[PDB]
Design a protein around this ligand. Structure first.
Ligand code: HEM
Ligand code: H2S
Length: 184
């Protein structure tokens, strides 16, 4: 189960964050890691379509090859804090698993600037028991975390050395599909 009420960035700029571009996960901190963690690569596009906040997600496990996409509409809880019902889709946006109650994640932007962000997510999926996940994002694939986001990690009272890097994972990303999915 999740345990954190993440605080959103003061002065969070939603239009800048939800601009249609892609964010790559470069480092992450799972507060409830599985006994045997599946080391996934992940990226998302965040945008606005017809005035609705949307995110498209991409997960890729570079060992098993497991790959999946999702699209979500985000509902506002407060500035920088959202609740997202996800639907699993193929890369083209065709629905594989429909939206359903209890399949959602919360999403809090704790820090963001033009190139980087720190987010918290809490995933709820059926009868699974999942915990908090923090992620450092960058606009550039596998970019080393800069001082601004690392300082935000500290300011959240988290230790960056505890984060797991995805940068050495042989990750590949379908960023064109993520961008196009925002309308789906
Ligand atoms: C490197 C960072 C991440 C890792 C290692 C990771 C890992 C995983 C894993 C292992 C699952 C499968 C859960 C299961 O069904 O047992 C999953 C599902 C999911 N994750 Fe992540 N994740 C990451 C980042 C993110 C982010 C940043 C978000 C939200 C923005 C997110 C949202 C989701 C959603 C919505 C699902 C369920 C999708 C579906 O079933 O259709 N993940 N993730
Ligand atoms: S996740």
């Amino acid at each position: 189960a999740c345990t954190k009420n993440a605080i959103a960035q003061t002065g969070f700029n939603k239009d800048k964050y939800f601009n249609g571009d892609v964010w790559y996960v470069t480092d992450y901190l799972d507060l409830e890691p599985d006994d045997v963690p599946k080391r996934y690569c992940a990226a998302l596009a965040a945008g606005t379509a017809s005035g609705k906040l949307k995110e498209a997600l991409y997960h890729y496990d570079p060992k098993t090859q497991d790959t999946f996409y999702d699209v979500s509409e985000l509902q506002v809880e407060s500035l920088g804090k959202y609740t997202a019902n996800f639907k699993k889709v193929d890369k083209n946006g065709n629905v594989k698993v429909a939206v359903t109650a209890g399949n959602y994640y919360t999403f809090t932007v704790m820090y963001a600037d033009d190139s980087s962000a720190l987010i918290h997510t809490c995933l709820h999926k059926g009868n699974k028991d999942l915990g908090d996940l923090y992620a450092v994002l960058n606009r550039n694939k596998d970019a080393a975390a800069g001082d601004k986001v690392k300082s935000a990690v500290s300011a959240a009272t988290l230790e960056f050395s505890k984060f797991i890097s995805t940068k050495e994972n042989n990750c590949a990303y379908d960023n064109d599909s993520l961008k196009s999915l925002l309308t789906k």
